[PDB]
Amino acid sequence: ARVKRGVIARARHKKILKQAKGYYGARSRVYRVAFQAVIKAGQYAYRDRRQRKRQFRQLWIARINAAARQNGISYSKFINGLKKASVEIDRKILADIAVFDKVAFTALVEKAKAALA
Amino acid sequence: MRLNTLSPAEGSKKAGKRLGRGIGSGLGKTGGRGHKGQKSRSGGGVRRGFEGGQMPLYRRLPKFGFTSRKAAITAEVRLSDLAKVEGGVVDLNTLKAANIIGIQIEFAKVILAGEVTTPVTVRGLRVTKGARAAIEAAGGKIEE
Amino acid sequence: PKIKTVRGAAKRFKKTGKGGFKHKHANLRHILTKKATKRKRHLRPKAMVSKGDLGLVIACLPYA
Amino acid sequence: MELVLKDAQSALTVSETTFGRDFNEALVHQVVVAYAAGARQGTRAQKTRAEVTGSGKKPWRQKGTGRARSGSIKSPIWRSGGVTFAARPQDHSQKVNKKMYRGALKSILSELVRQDRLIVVEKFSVEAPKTKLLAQKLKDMALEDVLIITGELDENLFLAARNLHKVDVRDATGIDPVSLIAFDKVVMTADAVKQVEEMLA
RNA sequence: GCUUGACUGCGAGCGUGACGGCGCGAGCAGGUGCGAAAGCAGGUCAUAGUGAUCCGGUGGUUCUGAAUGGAAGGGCCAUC
RNA sequence: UAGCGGCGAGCGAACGGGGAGCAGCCCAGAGCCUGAAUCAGUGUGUGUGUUAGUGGAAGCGUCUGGAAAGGCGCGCGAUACAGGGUGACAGCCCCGUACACAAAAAUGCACAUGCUGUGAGCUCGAUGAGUAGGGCGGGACACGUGGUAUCCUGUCUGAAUAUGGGGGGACCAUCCUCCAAGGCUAAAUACUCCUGACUGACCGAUAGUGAACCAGUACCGUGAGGGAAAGGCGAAAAGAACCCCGGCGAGGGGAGUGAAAAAGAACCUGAAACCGUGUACGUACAAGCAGUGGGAGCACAGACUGUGUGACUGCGUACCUUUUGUAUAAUGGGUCAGCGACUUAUAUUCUGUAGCAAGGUUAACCGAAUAGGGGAGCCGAAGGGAAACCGAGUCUUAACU
Numbered sequence A: 001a002r003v004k005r006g007v008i009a010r011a012r013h014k015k016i017l018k019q020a021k022g023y024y025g026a027r028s029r030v031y032r033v034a035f036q037a038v039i040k041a042g043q044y045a046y047r048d049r050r051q052r053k054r055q056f057r058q059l060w061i062a063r064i065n066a067a068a069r070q071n072g073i074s075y076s077k078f079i080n081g082l083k084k085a086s087v088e089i090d091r092k093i094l095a096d097i098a099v100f101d102k103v104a105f106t107a108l109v110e111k112a113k114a115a116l117a
Numbered sequence B: 001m002r003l004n005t006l007s008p009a010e011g012s013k014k015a016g017k018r019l020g021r022g023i024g025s026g027l028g029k030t031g032g033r034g035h036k037g038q039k040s041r042s043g044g045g046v047r048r049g050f051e052g053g054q055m056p057l058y059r060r061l062p063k064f065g066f067t068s069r070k071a072a073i074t075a076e077v078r079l080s081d082l083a084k085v086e087g088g089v090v091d092l093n094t095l096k097a098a099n100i101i102g103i104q105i106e107f108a109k110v111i112l113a114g115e116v117t118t119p120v121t122v123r124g125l126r127v128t129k130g131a132r133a134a135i136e137a138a139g140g141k142i143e144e
Numbered sequence C: 001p002k003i004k005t006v007r008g009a010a011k012r013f014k015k016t017g018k019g020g021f022k023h024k025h026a027n028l029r030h031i032l033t034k035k036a037t038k039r040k041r042h043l044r045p046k047a048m049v050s051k052g053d054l055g056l057v058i059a060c061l062p063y064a
Numbered sequence D: 001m002e003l004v005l006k007d008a009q010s011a012l013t014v015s016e017t018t019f020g021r022d023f024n025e026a027l028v029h030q031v032v033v034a035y036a037a038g039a040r041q042g043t044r045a046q047k048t049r050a051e052v053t054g055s056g057k058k059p060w061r062q063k064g065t066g067r068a069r070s071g072s073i074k075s076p077i078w079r080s081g082g083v084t085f086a087a088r089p090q091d092h093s094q095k096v097n098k099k100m101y102r103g104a105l106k107s108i109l110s111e112l113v114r115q116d117r118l119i120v121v122e123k124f125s126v127e128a129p130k131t132k133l134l135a136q137k138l139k140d141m142a143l144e145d146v147l148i149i150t151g152e153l154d155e156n157l158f159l160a161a162r163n164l165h166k167v168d169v170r171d172a173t174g175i176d177p178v179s180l181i182a183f184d185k186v187v188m189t190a191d192a193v194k195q196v197e198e199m200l201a
Numbered sequence E: 001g002c003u004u005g006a007c008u009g010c011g012a013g014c015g016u017g018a019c020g021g022c023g024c025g026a027g028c029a030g031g032u033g034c035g036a037a038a039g040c041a042g043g044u045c046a047u048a049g050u051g052a053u054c055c056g057g058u059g060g061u062u063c064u065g066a067a068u069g070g071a072a073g074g075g076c077c078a079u080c
Numbered sequence F: 001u002a003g004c005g006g007c008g009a010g011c012g013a014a015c016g017g018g019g020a021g022c023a024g025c026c027c028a029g030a031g032c033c034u035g036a037a038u039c040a041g042u043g044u045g046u047g048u049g050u051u052a053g054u055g056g057a058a059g060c061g062u063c064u065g066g067a068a069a070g071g072c073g074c075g076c077g078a079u080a081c082a083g084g085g086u087g088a089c090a091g092c093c094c095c096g097u098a099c100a101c102a103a104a105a106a107u108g109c110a111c112a113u114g115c116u117g118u119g120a121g122c123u124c125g126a127u128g129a130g131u132a133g134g135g136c137g138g139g140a141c142a143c144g145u146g147g148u149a150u151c152c153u154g155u156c157u158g159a160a161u162a163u164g165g166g167g168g169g170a171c172c173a174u175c176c177u178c179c180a181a182g183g184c185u186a187a188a189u190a191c192u193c194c195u196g197a198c199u200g201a202c203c204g205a206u207a208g209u210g211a212a213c214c215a216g217u218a219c220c221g222u223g224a225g226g227g228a229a230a231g232g233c234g235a236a237a238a239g240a241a242c243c244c245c246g247g248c249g250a251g252g253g254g255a256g257u258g259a260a261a262a263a264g265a266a267c268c269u270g271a272a273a274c275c276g277u278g279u280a281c282g283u284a285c286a287a288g289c290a291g292u293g294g295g296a297g298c299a300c301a302g303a304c305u306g307u308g309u310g311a312c313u314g315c316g317u318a319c320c321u322u323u324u325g326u327a328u329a330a331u332g333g334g335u336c337a338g339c340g341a342c343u344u345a346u347a348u349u350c351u352g353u354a355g356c357a358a359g360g361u362u363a364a365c366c367g368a369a370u371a372g373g374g375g376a377g378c379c380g381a382a383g384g385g386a387a388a389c390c391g392a393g394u395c396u397u398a399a400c401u
């Protein structure tokens, strides 16, 4: 029962290499290196799905701060006012509104200011 | 019922451990031997009753007694064996023919174990008190 | 081939009704006059093998 | 138990234990597997590093050359070295308890009767030792893949069978569970069925 | 002052040890000592004063005894 | 198991039982009757092998295709559908196979028979002496000198002799059993350099023999000795006439063969490392495990999404091993391809599962053979005690509350 292992071994290697397409040098050519690279990429991807959520929130906050200040109120104050006013618009949407609809954002800011004081 | 429809009972065949076939297997690199010691080694381990050097129990404790050669040629019979013979006489030869006692068995005892219903004549055998009473109740006879 | 018995173990241990092992106590072999009579008396009867060393004894005596 | 016959349309009484018991699949499976194992031959052998033809001298000195440390040219991790766990000829024959075997046979027989794969007849003799005649008889009986079990040993029948690979003629003494399961239909003579009952009990 | 409890067989039940073991123990049976008696006594105020197994030695024995009767040897108990 | 054993590690019977096979004889010796059974050689006849061989059934049409043995139709043989070939997979094309036959000659084994040697039966005897024992030293018996029986003998001794002697595990008595110091003897048992047939949950060119090949070769070594690598065009050479470039080269382009020459002998398939040519995009102000998340632009493919690239940007110090702890400046790896490590046998225990169940199961072996016989044995249904022994109890003790 001499199970020769050429076909399986090559298929396995090929799958890993294909996954490692687009990597510089032996990381896309040489299995040992490619496999190492592929595993590393997987790890990074897991990390970065989390980091992606973090990053985008950061961006939205930055944009909202810029817009609110243009309408004469800091971000923290603006958020507090909105919370007080019971406005549940999340800051992805707020950022989008700020970028594409200045009138709407201004209205929101006015609401926050009124609620605040 | 074809030769490709039969199947074993569930739990009959179990998976055979294969050591050292990768991480997912469970029994990975080391093969369930831990890390480098004597037991880890191929051929590794210590003989039966070895205690690192401590005088092993089978030596600590004193030898005792002797083996009886008459015990090897004694035997113990049951009332169910008094029924397992054929006829109504229980000698050594009869018991041996029945296949109850071993061939090189000079002596045998009938013990109160099981029960005897038919009347049997125990000849030339030792019989315990309970067994004797039981046989008599059955309607038997004991003689030397 | 057949597993061989540890003959020393065979000499020192005997199996009981449920599958224990009785054994003779140590220390009742020589210098006795200093040992107290009570101690000697207690050592005299046989004794069951403890839970700790039962496994070792079993390994020693596979046909017991 | 009662099997109606094909040729006379007359009943034949048999034991409920033998021909009407439950199908114990696990038992049957074990017996068939055992049969297969027994049938295998098991003649092979590789060479261990002991047996591989070569000198037992150290290919190079333990230290110094910088090469990895080698001891024998016959090492299993060397090309043209021994097989690590080289095979020897071995006996794959499993034991089967007599009762277990008999029970399996009983189950198979019962299954056949239930599934209408056991056909009982009064007599299945061919006149000449001619394959053509046997084939015609089988066609007339509608049959193609079949185990013809006969009580008394018949020369014409055996010879006629010999060249039909779908057909197999056996003596009632020489039935086997794999054969019964394998053959599409099983045609037993009345004497054969009676004999089988006596055998199995 | 008188004595040999520096008893023999056991021992509910505990303590302490991985185990080998080691320790405390009321009470029961037999037989004793002191006490008028109740009682106490199974060594010493307690905790060190010690060495497993094997192999032998000595004494006893209602065990065994390689055809049989013995014997040797073995076992068991005490001890070196 | 009983035993042996620094009573350690280990070694390890016998009695008795079941099988295979079973064959008993002769000389220490002379009288009789005496070519008397048996055995061996040697001629002859018969039978059956062996060493060459002979015969050996039955299929065409059509489609695809380079080619049919394949598809689809309709037939036939089969005591032959084992197997191998033939342009793809053939019971019926070829060689065979089942079955039936065959030997001038040589020879194996049977009987039958002739010749030579060989000696059967009766009565009377006789019954292996430097031997058995012993002392000393060793060795063999499961038995290590131990209480050590038995066997062998290097050394020194040394009986009795059937009115006798050996053994029965120190030794003595009784009883039983046998007759040493002289031989022969088939079968069942062991093995395979070699010959034939057949088989494989054996390998399929780094495997299987070291050796599929001109291999114990090349090569290495003074020598003993060590010891490789290396298989495949095509169905058939039909192996490329002729022309051209080139050195009357190598190599190549046509031509031709072929089903196919990106099947051209550096020949089936033809992966990966590695090296090129072409196209798209990126890249010459930019600092690090080279990815990942976000992401512009550009190119392409279709009707915006797929693909390719990735400016810029957040995060981010390989893998294994070994360690309290490794980016570690600790180990290992240049890469790829192939191979490379928890197996096997037998005992034992526990778990699952199947069978039967106070029973379960057979081993050798026999066997028209994985059937059926075979229950010799083994485990269990009773333990206690060191043991005799007792026994649902038993041991302890004079006895146990």
Ligand SMILES: [Mg+2]
Pocket (backbone or CB within 6 Å): B025, B026, B027
């Ligand atoms: Mg695990």
Ligand SMILES: [Mg+2]
Pocket (backbone or CB within 6 Å): B026
């Ligand atoms: Mg794990």
Ligand SMILES: [Mg+2]
Pocket (backbone or CB within 6 Å): B031, B032, B033, B034
């Ligand atoms: Mg483990």
Ligand SMILES: [Mg+2]
Pocket (backbone or CB within 6 Å): B036
């Ligand atoms: Mg390691």
Ligand SMILES: [Mg+2]
Pocket (backbone or CB within 6 Å): B035, B036
């Ligand atoms: Mg360590």
Ligand SMILES: [Mg+2]
Pocket (backbone or CB within 6 Å): B033, B034, B035, B036, B037, B038, B039, B040
């Ligand atoms: Mg360890």
Ligand SMILES: [Mg+2]
Pocket (backbone or CB within 6 Å): B042, B043
């Ligand atoms: Mg090793």
Ligand SMILES: [Mg+2]
Pocket (backbone or CB within 6 Å): B099, B101, B102, B103
């Ligand atoms: Mg028996």
Ligand SMILES: [Mg+2]
Pocket (backbone or CB within 6 Å): C028, C029
């Ligand atoms: Mg003592």
Ligand SMILES: [Mg+2]
Pocket (backbone or CB within 6 Å): none
């Ligand atoms: Mg050497």
Ligand SMILES: [Mg+2]
Pocket (backbone or CB within 6 Å): D047, D052, D080, D081, D082, D083
């Ligand atoms: Mg090899």
Ligand SMILES: [Mg+2]
Pocket (backbone or CB within 6 Å): none
């Ligand atoms: Mg059988």
Ligand SMILES: [Mg+2]
Pocket (backbone or CB within 6 Å): none
């Ligand atoms: Mg008084």
Ligand SMILES: [Mg+2]
Pocket (backbone or CB within 6 Å): none
């Ligand atoms: Mg003191």
Ligand SMILES: [Mg+2]
Pocket (backbone or CB within 6 Å): E053, E054
């Ligand atoms: Mg010792």
Ligand SMILES: [Mg+2]
Pocket (backbone or CB within 6 Å): E055
């Ligand atoms: Mg000694």
